[PDB]
């Protein structure tokens, strides 16, 4: 089939992603490039990974990390963005 099955974490990862971004709007309020960037990279990230449980881990992890640790929000921004391309729209490694 695919992996776990016909699973769909699409709905999750979309609003999940914004949980981070809406937070990013607060934190990187003087830098409105971050949020649109994360949006942008997600758009050009392969829709499969974005609809997979793995990305749900990434999101739930990095987003909530950035919530607890605003000081390193960017690292999680960095991760989440790289995460998108690392495992999507370039997925030869995995």
């Amino acid at each position: 089939g695919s992996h776990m099955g016909k699973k769909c974490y699409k709905l999750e990862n979309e609003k999940l992603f914004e949980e981070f971004l809406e937070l990013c709007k607060m934190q990187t309020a003087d830098h409105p490039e971050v949020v649109p960037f994360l949006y942008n990279r997600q758009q050009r990230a392969h829709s499969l990974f974005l609809a997979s449980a793995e990305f749900c881990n990434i999101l739930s992890r990095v987003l909530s990390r950035a919530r607890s640790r605003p000081a390193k929000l960017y690292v999680y921004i960095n991760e989440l963005c790289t995460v998108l391309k690392a495992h999507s729209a370039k997925k030869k490694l995995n």
Binding site: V34, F37, A71, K72, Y74, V75, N78, C81, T82, A86
Partner: peptide
């Protein structure tokens, strides 16, 4: 090798204390 700037891709213009 770096086929993307990855984390530094952000660092280019914005970042925190790090």
């Amino acid at each position: 090798g770096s086929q993307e700037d990855s984390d530094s891709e952000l660092e280019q213009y914005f970042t925190a204390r790090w």
